[PDB]
Design an enzyme around this catalytic site. Sequence first.
Site, PDB file in Angstrom:
ATOM      1  N   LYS A 152       1.086  -1.569  -0.054  1.00 28.20           N
ATOM      2  CA  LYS A 152      -0.397   0.182   0.373  1.00 28.20           C
ATOM      3  C   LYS A 152       1.042   1.319  -0.065  1.00 28.20           C
ATOM      4  O   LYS A 152       0.577   2.461  -0.320  1.00 28.20           O
ATOM      5  CB  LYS A 152      -0.647   0.024   1.073  1.00 28.20           C
ATOM      6  CG  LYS A 152      -0.132   0.392   2.502  1.00 28.20           C
ATOM      7  CD  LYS A 152      -1.090  -0.166   3.495  1.00 28.20           C
ATOM      8  CE  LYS A 152      -0.955  -0.604   5.133  1.00 28.20           C
ATOM      9  NZ  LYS A 152       0.099  -1.975   5.045  1.00 28.20           N
ATOM     10  N   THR A 153       1.792   1.371  -0.196  1.00 27.21           N
ATOM     11  CA  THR A 153       2.781   2.555  -0.287  1.00 27.21           C
ATOM     12  C   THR A 153       3.233   2.902  -1.962  1.00 27.21           C
ATOM     13  O   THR A 153       2.930   4.714  -1.706  1.00 27.21           O
ATOM     14  CB  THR A 153       4.058   1.929   1.049  1.00 27.21           C
ATOM     15  OG1 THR A 153       4.108   1.097   2.087  1.00 27.21           O
ATOM     16  CG2 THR A 153       4.984   3.343   1.247  1.00 27.21           C
ATOM     17  N   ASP A 158       3.952   7.829   4.687  1.00 22.91           N
ATOM     18  CA  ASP A 158       4.351   6.116   4.915  1.00 22.91           C
ATOM     19  C   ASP A 158       4.453   5.506   6.283  1.00 22.91           C
ATOM     20  O   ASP A 158       5.163   5.970   7.669  1.00 22.91           O
ATOM     21  CB  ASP A 158       4.816   5.189   4.067  1.00 22.91           C
ATOM     22  CG  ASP A 158       6.059   5.864   3.591  1.00 22.91           C
ATOM     23  OD1 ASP A 158       6.777   6.435   5.173  1.00 22.91           O
ATOM     24  OD2 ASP A 158       6.832   5.756   3.386  1.00 22.91           O
ATOM     25  N   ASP A 159       3.843   4.597   6.268  1.00 24.05           N
ATOM     26  CA  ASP A 159       4.148   3.662   7.552  1.00 24.05           C
ATOM     27  C   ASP A 159       4.288   4.246   8.848  1.00 24.05           C
ATOM     28  O   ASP A 159       5.687   4.159   9.926  1.00 24.05           O
ATOM     29  CB  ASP A 159       5.733   2.942   6.887  1.00 24.05           C
ATOM     30  CG  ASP A 159       5.920   2.029   5.469  1.00 24.05           C
ATOM     31  OD1 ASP A 159       4.825   1.253   5.542  1.00 24.05           O
ATOM     32  OD2 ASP A 159       5.771   2.242   5.314  1.00 24.05           O
ATOM     33  N   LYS A 207      -6.222  17.864  11.719  1.00 22.52           N
ATOM     34  CA  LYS A 207      -7.584  18.974  11.945  1.00 22.52           C
ATOM     35  C   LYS A 207      -6.942  20.120  11.609  1.00 22.52           C
ATOM     36  O   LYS A 207      -8.052  21.489  11.945  1.00 22.52           O
ATOM     37  CB  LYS A 207      -7.707  18.532  13.612  1.00 22.52           C
ATOM     38  CG  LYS A 207      -9.250  19.410  14.202  1.00 22.52           C
ATOM     39  CD  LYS A 207     -10.395  19.282  13.622  1.00 22.52           C
ATOM     40  CE  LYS A 207     -11.186  17.572  14.250  1.00 22.52           C
ATOM     41  NZ  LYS A 207     -12.247  17.196  13.581  1.00 22.52           N
ATOM     42  N   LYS A 259       3.998  -8.515  -1.373  1.00 22.57           N
ATOM     43  CA  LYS A 259       4.930  -8.465  -1.336  1.00 22.57           C
ATOM     44  C   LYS A 259       6.596  -9.458  -0.771  1.00 22.57           C
ATOM     45  O   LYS A 259       7.496 -10.054  -1.338  1.00 22.57           O
ATOM     46  CB  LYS A 259       5.730  -7.269  -0.047  1.00 22.57           C
ATOM     47  CG  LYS A 259       7.290  -6.728  -0.155  1.00 22.57           C
ATOM     48  CD  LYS A 259       6.726  -5.453   0.706  1.00 22.57           C
ATOM     49  CE  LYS A 259       7.723  -4.429   1.514  1.00 22.57           C
ATOM     50  NZ  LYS A 259       7.345  -4.104   2.379  1.00 22.57           N
TER      51      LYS A 259
HETATM   52  N1  LIG Z   1      -1.394  -4.834  -7.131  1.00 22.33           N
HETATM   53  C1  LIG Z   1      -0.107  -5.307  -6.216  1.00 22.33           C
HETATM   54  N2  LIG Z   1      -0.129  -4.774  -5.253  1.00 22.33           N
HETATM   55  C2  LIG Z   1       0.716  -4.328  -4.101  1.00 22.33           C
HETATM   56  N3  LIG Z   1       2.201  -4.134  -3.864  1.00 22.33           N
HETATM   57  C3  LIG Z   1       2.362  -4.803  -4.834  1.00 22.33           C
HETATM   58  C4  LIG Z   1       1.513  -4.241  -6.331  1.00 22.33           C
HETATM   59  N4  LIG Z   1       2.602  -4.452  -7.207  1.00 22.33           N
HETATM   60  C5  LIG Z   1       3.603  -4.221  -6.678  1.00 22.33           C
HETATM   61  N5  LIG Z   1       3.556  -4.168  -5.735  1.00 22.33           N
HETATM   62  C6  LIG Z   1       4.975  -3.959  -5.252  1.00 22.33           C
HETATM   63  O1  LIG Z   1       4.479  -4.161  -3.321  1.00 22.33           O
HETATM   64  C7  LIG Z   1       6.091  -3.024  -2.822  1.00 22.33           C
HETATM   65  C8  LIG Z   1       5.181  -2.897  -2.242  1.00 22.33           C
HETATM   66  O2  LIG Z   1       5.895  -1.832  -0.690  1.00 22.33           O
HETATM   67  P1  LIG Z   1       5.787  -1.118   0.506  1.00 22.33           P
HETATM   68  O3  LIG Z   1       6.342   0.216   1.297  1.00 22.33           O
HETATM   69  O4  LIG Z   1       3.748  -1.008   0.241  1.00 22.33           O
HETATM   70  O5  LIG Z   1       5.359  -2.497   1.610  1.00 22.33           O
HETATM   71  P2  LIG Z   1       4.605  -3.154   2.189  1.00 22.33           P
HETATM   72  O6  LIG Z   1       3.380  -3.357   1.917  1.00 22.33           O
HETATM   73  O7  LIG Z   1       4.167  -1.388   2.812  1.00 22.33           O
HETATM   74  O8  LIG Z   1       5.188  -3.288   3.934  1.00 22.33           O
HETATM   75  P3  LIG Z   1       4.048  -3.513   5.291  1.00 22.33           P
HETATM   76  O9  LIG Z   1       2.988  -3.781   4.623  1.00 22.33           O
HETATM   77  O10 LIG Z   1       4.716  -4.900   5.366  1.00 22.33           O
HETATM   78  O11 LIG Z   1       4.756  -2.044   5.255  1.00 22.33           O
HETATM   79  C9  LIG Z   1       5.507  -2.353  -3.590  1.00 22.33           C
HETATM   80  O12 LIG Z   1       7.325  -2.813  -3.528  1.00 22.33           O
HETATM   81  C10 LIG Z   1       5.706  -2.908  -5.138  1.00 22.33           C
HETATM   82  O13 LIG Z   1       6.469  -3.016  -6.191  1.00 22.33           O
END
Ligand SMILES: Nc1ncnc2c1ncn2[C@@H]1O[C@H](COP(=O)(O)OP(=O)(O)OP(=O)(O)O)[C@@H](O)[C@H]1O
Lengths: 49, 85, 449
Positions: free
Chosen positions: C260-261, C314-315, C342, C419
Site C-alpha cells: 500500500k505504500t 507512510d508506515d 484537523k 510483497k
Molecule cells: N498490485 C500490487 N499490490 C500490492 N503490492 C504491489 C503490487 N504491485 C507491486 N507491488 C509491490 O509491493 C511493494 C510494496 O512495498 P511497500 O512499501 O508498500 O511495502 P508494504 O506492503 O507497505 O510493507 P508493509 O505493508 O509490510 O509495511 C512494492 O515494492 C511494489 O513493487
Amino acid sequence: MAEDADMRNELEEMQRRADQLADESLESTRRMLQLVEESKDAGIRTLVM
Amino acid sequence: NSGLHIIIFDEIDAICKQRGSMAGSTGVHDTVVNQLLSKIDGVEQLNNILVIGMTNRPDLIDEALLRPGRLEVKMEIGLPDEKGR
Amino acid sequence: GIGGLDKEFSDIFRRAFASRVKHVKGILLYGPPGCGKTLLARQIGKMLNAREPKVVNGPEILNKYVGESEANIRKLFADAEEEQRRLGANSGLHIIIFDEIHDTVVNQLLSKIDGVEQLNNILVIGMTPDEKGRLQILHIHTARMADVDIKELAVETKNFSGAELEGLVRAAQSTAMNRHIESLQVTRGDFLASLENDIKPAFGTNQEDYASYIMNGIIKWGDPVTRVLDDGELLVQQTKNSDRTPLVSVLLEGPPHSGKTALAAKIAEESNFPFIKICSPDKMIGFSETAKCQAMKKIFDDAYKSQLSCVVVDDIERLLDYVPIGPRFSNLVLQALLVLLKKAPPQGRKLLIIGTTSRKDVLQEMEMLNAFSTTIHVPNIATGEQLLEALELLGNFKDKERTTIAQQVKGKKVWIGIKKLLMLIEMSLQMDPEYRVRKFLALLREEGA
Ligand SMILES: Nc1ncnc2c1ncn2[C@@H]1O[C@H](COP(=O)(O)OP(=O)(O)OP(=O)(O)O)[C@@H](O)[C@H]1O
C-alpha cells in the site's frame, strides 16, 4: 553560553623602508661627524703659527 | 602567445581560507585570494599560462575559489587498484 | 527580457519605483544559482534611468587592506553622496550594485547609508536555466571557436548550467586530436558522450527519487485493486470541486507485505497536482523526535504554500516509533500529526493527506482514527483464483508448470500479501527447474497457506 574563547592574533609590520638604503644618509652623517674636526685642528694651529 | 611558462603553486590549503571568514577574526592579509584571483581573471583573462595545485585536504578551499571560471576543472586521484599498484 | 519571474518582477518594480516617480533605502534579492543573476541585476538598473550610472562592485571589494577599502568602499558611495549633496533639489539617482556578498565593514557599510547625512536619493542592491539564454552562451562562447545539435547541450541542462559548462567545450578539440602525438584530417567538432559526464559537477537540485518508492508498477490482480483505486480517486476528485473540506483525511490500511505504500503513490500520481511530496522514515533515519516533527512541518508548509496539493505519509507506526512489547512511542510527534489532520489550510487552499498503517487496532486504541476519515481496507490475497490471475498478469511461470500449482483451486486458502510473494517467486525460480514450483507451494504452505 558556557563559552570560553581566549585568542591571539599576529602583527603587520609597517613597511619601514625595508632595505639597507638608510645607510647612505647615515654615511653622510658619518662623514659630517668625521671630516669636520681637522678643519678646527689645523685652524687653531694655523692660528698658532 | 607561447605558453610553455607554468608554475607549481603547491599547498593551496594554507595560502587561502575560502573567503577569509574561516578562523573568525584574522589579519586582513592573513588571506589574500583577491590579488591572485584578480590576477588571473580579475583585470583580464590570461591564456598564456597554467597554474597547478596540490592539496591533501581540498574541502577547506573548495567552495569559494573553485567556483567555475576561477577553476572550473577539479580532479581527484584515488589510490591504485590492484593492477595499478 | 526575463525568463520566468514576472509575478516577482511585477511587484518588485512598483514598490521601489512607483513611489518615487520616506523612500526605501535599498532592496536586496536572494536567488538560486543559474538564475541568470547578473542579467537581472543589469536590467533593473537599466530600467531605472536612461543613462543613470550603472556602477558595478567587485567580489574582492575589501581588497587593498593596508588602508584603502575603508576609504575605497566609502569613496564610491561618497562620490554618490558627493553628487547628492551637490544638487539635492532637482532629483539625483545613483546606482551601485554589490554582487555575492568582517569587523569594520559591518558598522561602516550600514552607517554609510543612514549616518549623519540623510543619505537618501540612492539605492544599492545585492544579489546572492533560460535555455535560450544558454543558447546565447553557445553563440558567444561556443561560436568563439557532424557538430553538436543546435539544442541538445542546451536542453541537457538539468544536471549542469552554462555558467560552469566551460570545460569539455574547451577540451572538445582534444576529444579526437589526442592521438598520443602528420595530421589526421581536421575535425568536425564531433560531440559523442560529451554531454555532461566529462565534467559533471554542478548544481541543479535533483531530489526526485519518487519512482524508487514504487519499483514495480502495480498490476491489477483483482477487483479489490480497482476497488481501492476508484474509491480513492473519487476523493481526490471531489476535493477539486470541494467546499467546506479543504483538508481531507484518509487512512488506508492493510496487513503487512501488502503493498500500500507504492499504491498511495500511484493514486497520488494518477491525479495530477501542482505539488506532491512524500514523507518517508527512510529519509529521516536516526533523528530526534523534535527534529522529526520539524521535518514534517518543513514539508507540510511547503504543501501549504502551494495552492493545493496532496501529500502522503507512510508506515506511520514506525514514524511514531511504536513497539508493542510494552507500548512506547514519541507522543508529541503523534499529537502533532493528529492536530495537522484537523488543521485548516489558510483561506482557500485544499489538500489530501493520506496515511498507511500496518496495524489498525493500536491507533484505534490511541484515538487517532477519528481525526482520520473514510478509511480503506486493502486486503491480502484471500484466494488462489486471484493468485493465479496475479502471476498471470506478471508472467513468472510458464503455463505448463503453472498447471501444477493450478492443480489446487481452493485446495488451500491464502492469507498472503504481495510483497512476500513477489520475493518468494524469485527464490523459487532460483532453485533447479524441476523443484521451482515444488518449493513455491512448499513455502506458500510454510506460512500456513
Ligand atoms: N498490485 C500490487 N499490490 C500490492 N503490492 C504491489 C503490487 N504491485 C507491486 N507491488 C509491490 O509491493 C511493494 C510494496 O512495498 P511497500 O512499501 O508498500 O511495502 P508494504 O506492503 O507497505 O510493507 P508493509 O505493508 O509490510 O509495511 C512494492 O515494492 C511494489 O513493487
